[PDB]
């Protein structure tokens, strides 16, 4: 059947599925109803930066929008839906002054999907931070961010924490590092090259430690004060995506496993075990910060659950580990990243390059979590795959290799859990084909097709397919 066996019933009791947007990405009104510029903004802004100079001035328009589009998520069965704060739509300045009419729309939001019976799940930052806030303290790069995001937090706790119990701190900081600090293709552009500044080699670091810090403080501020009388839960959310040995080799093996370790064990290490993995302490050295006592036990316990974003997998190959000259913390893995096994690639592509379609990859991750660290609460906070640009509008809705994307996904996290893993949730990247960063609007990731020109919705396949595997 094309649901292949796939309902609730072969899920968990109360085990929860969603949709999953971000701010940014979908609200629009980008510098209307008082919100103030993100670095995404600016950057956006810049030509050349995004696929045909767009930007989320409009994006999906969600902020005008919002009532039609969870009466579409709740005709499509799904019980929550995840989406972001815009930082900037709340504090213009990233401090100071509050924005009311930012706050009446995240109040309205909030309302509404409970009216209609779906669970807010509330990221509190995805890669939007207030531009005042880079320009007068340098972002990431400065300690001062936890006191900064405390703050913030603290405001969201105290003005929606009434009604929401399910909060995440951050999306994918690993992003962030990566491609803001050592690749500097995002915001702030920083690399040993550019013309912004940086340093490839230390700056991923720093700016990884102080999002540790960072959703440590604002979880020990959500302990101490909000909790006792709210009863809710923060966690975080990591992208993941699988790494297998391209040979039994001793080499290959100890290779995907350093790559697991830099990946995910980067920040999964600290927030369970209180230290960061033994194989970065020994080859990133004086570049890795050190946790004091006092700050890895903040860090470590401070996530209810872990967010998982899981896309893809690929090969490792390793070599002899040797002594070298720091360049950047993606060479500091010392691997070989390998897409075909014996001849045959890995799994075909979906539009983006990155986005190679490996079911097993899902289980590959979910399964290590398990078997790694204690069984931790797990929700995938993000999963699906991409459309070209330029399709026609039935092209678009007959999206038939989503729908076996998600059947195949899904029937591997089911193998997963059947198997003990203690996984709560799962959330469809994305409710709406979006505005995706550095493609832009050439990269369709929806259930529901999104008419540009328009703003118009329609429900594809893969929407209608989760109706029927969601039904009550
Ligand atoms: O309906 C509005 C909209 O729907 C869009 O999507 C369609 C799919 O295109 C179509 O293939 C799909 O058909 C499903 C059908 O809904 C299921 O009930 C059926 O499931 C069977 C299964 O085949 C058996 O093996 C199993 O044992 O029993 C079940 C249930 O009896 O499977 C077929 C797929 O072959 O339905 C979607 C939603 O209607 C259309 O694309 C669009 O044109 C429509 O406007
Ligand atoms: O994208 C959909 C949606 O989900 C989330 O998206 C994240 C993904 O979770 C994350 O895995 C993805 O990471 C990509 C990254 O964008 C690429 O730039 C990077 O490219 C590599 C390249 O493949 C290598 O050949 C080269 O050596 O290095 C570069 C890195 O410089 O590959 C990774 C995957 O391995 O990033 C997505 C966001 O950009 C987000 O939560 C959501 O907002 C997205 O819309
Ligand atoms: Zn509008």
Same mark, same amino acid.
């Given at each position: 059947?094309?649901?292949?066996?796939?309902?609730?019933?072969?899920?968990?009791?109360?085990?929860?599925?969603?949709?999953?947007?971000?701010?940014?990405?979908?609200?629009?009104?980008?510098?209307?109803?008082?919100?103030?510029?993100? =670095?995404?903004? +600016?950057?956006?802004?810049?030509?050349?930066?995004?696929?045909?100079?767009?930007?989320? *001035?409009?994006?999906? *328009?969600?902020?005008?929008?919002? @009532?039609? /589009?969870?009466?579409?998520?709740?005709?499509? $069965?799904?019980?929550? !839906?995840?989406?972001?704060?815009?930082?900037?739509?709340?504090?213009? /300045?990233?401090?100071?002054?509050? %924005?009311?009419?930012?706050?009446?729309?995240? $109040?309205?939001?909030?309302?509404?999907?409970?009216?209609?019976?779906?669970?807010?799940?509330?990221?509190?930052?995805?890669?939007?931070?207030?531009?005042?806030?880079? @320009?007068?303290?340098?972002?990431?790069?400065?300690?001062?961010?936890? #006191?900064?995001?405390?703050?913030?937090?603290?405001?969201?706790?105290?003005?929606?924490?009434?009604?929401?119990?399910?909060?995440?701190?951050? $999306?994918?900081?690993?992003?962030?590092?990566?491609?803001?600090?050592?690749?500097?293709?995002?915001?702030?552009?920083?690399?040993?090259?550019?013309?912004?500044?940086?340093?490839?080699?230390?700056?991923?670091?720093?700016?990884?430690?102080?999002?540790?810090?960072?959703?440590? +403080?604002?979880?020990?501020?959500?302990?101490?004060?909000?909790?006792?009388?709210?009863?809710?839960?923060?966690? =975080?959310?990591?992208?993941?995506?699988?790494?297998?040995?391209?040979?039994?080799?001793?080499? #290959?093996?100890?290779?995907?496993?350093?790559?697991?370790?830099?990946?995910?064990?980067?920040?999964?290490?600290?927030?369970?075990?209180?230290?960061?993995?033994?194989?970065?302490?020994?080859?990133?050295?004086?570049?890795?910060?050190?946790?004091?006592?006092?700050?890895?036990?903040?860090?470590?316990?401070? +996530? #209810?659950?872990?967010?998982?974003?899981?896309?893809?997998?690929?090969?490792?190959?390793?070599?002899?580990?040797?002594?070298?000259?720091?360049?950047? !913390?993606? +060479?500091?893995?010392?691997?070989?990243?390998?897409?075909?096994?014996?001849?045959?690639?890995?799994?075909?592509?979906? %539009?983006?390059?990155?986005?190679?379609?490996?079911?097993?990859?899902?289980?590959?991750?979910?399964?290590?979590?398990?078997?790694?660290?204690?069984?931790?609460?797990?929700?995938?906070?993000?999963?699906?795959?991409?459309?070209?640009?330029?399709?026609?509008?039935?092209?678009?809705?007959?999206?038939?290799?989503?729908?076996?994307?998600?059947?195949?996904?899904?029937?591997?996290?089911?193998?997963?859990? *059947?198997?003990?893993?203690?996984?709560?949730?799962?959330?469809?990247?994305?409710?709406?084909? %979006?505005?995706?960063?550095?493609?832009?609007?050439?990269?369709?990731?929806?259930?529901?097709?999104? *008419?540009? %020109?328009?703003?118009?919705?329609?429900?594809?396949?893969?929407?209608?397919?989760?109706?029927?595997?969601? @039904?009550?």
């Amino acid at each position: 059947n094309w649901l292949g066996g796939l309902s609730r019933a072969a899920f968990p009791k109360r085990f929860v599925f969603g949709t999953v947007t971000s701010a940014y990405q979908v609200e629009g009104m980008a510098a209307s109803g008082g919100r103030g510029p993100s =670095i995404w903004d +600016a950057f956006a802004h810049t030509p050349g930066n995004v696929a045909g100079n767009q930007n989320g *001035d409009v994006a999906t *328009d969600q902020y005008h929008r919002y @009532k039609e /589009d969870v009466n579409l998520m709740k005709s499509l $069965n799904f019980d929550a !839906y995840r989406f972001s704060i815009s930082w900037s739509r709340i504090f213009p /300045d990233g401090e100071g002054r509050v %924005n009311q009419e930012g706050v009446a729309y995240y $109040n309205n939001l909030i309302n509404y999907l409970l009216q209609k019976g779906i669970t807010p799940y509330v990221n509190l930052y995805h890669y939007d931070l207030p531009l005042a806030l880079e @320009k007068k303290y340098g972002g990431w790069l400065n300690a001062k961010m936890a #006191d900064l995001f405390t703050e913030y937090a603290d405001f969201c706790f105290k003005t929606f924490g009434n009604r929401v119990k399910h909060w995440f701190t951050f $999306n994918e900081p690993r992003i962030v590092a990566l491609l803001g600090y050592d690749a500097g293709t995002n915001p702030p552009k920083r690399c040993t090259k550019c013309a912004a500044g940086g340093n490839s080699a230390t700056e991923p670091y720093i700016v990884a430690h102080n999002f540790l810090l960072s959703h440590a +403080a604002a979880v020990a501020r959500y302990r101490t004060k909000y909790q006792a009388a709210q009863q809710g839960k923060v966690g =975080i959310v990591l992208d993941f995506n699988w790494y297998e040995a391209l040979s039994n080799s001793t080499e #290959d093996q100890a290779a995907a496993q350093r790559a697991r370790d830099f990946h995910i064990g980067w920040y999964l290490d600290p927030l369970i075990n209180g230290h960061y993995p033994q194989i970065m302490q020994d080859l990133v050295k004086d570049r890795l910060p050190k946790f004091t006592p006092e700050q890895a036990r903040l860090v470590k316990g401070s +996530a #209810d659950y872990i967010g998982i974003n899981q896309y893809t997998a690929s090969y490792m190959k390793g070599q002899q580990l040797m002594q070298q000259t720091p360049t950047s !913390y993606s +060479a500091d893995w010392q691997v070989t990243a390998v897409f075909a096994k014996n001849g045959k690639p890995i799994g075909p592509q979906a %539009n983006s390059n990155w986005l190679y379609i490996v079911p097993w990859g899902m289980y590959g991750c979910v399964n290590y979590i398990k078997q790694k660290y204690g069984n931790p609460t797990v929700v995938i906070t993000g999963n699906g795959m991409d459309q070209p640009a330029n399709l026609s509008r039935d092209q678009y809705l007959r999206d038939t290799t989503r729908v076996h994307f998600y059947r195949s996904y899904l029937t591997q996290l089911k193998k997963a859990i *059947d198997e003990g893993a203690n996984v709560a949730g799962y959330f469809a990247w994305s409710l709406l084909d %979006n505005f995706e960063w550095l493609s832009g609007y050439t990269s369709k990731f929806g259930i529901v097709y999104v *008419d540009f %020109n328009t703003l118009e919705r329609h429900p594809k396949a893969s929407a209608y397919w989760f109706r029927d595997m969601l @039904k009550h």
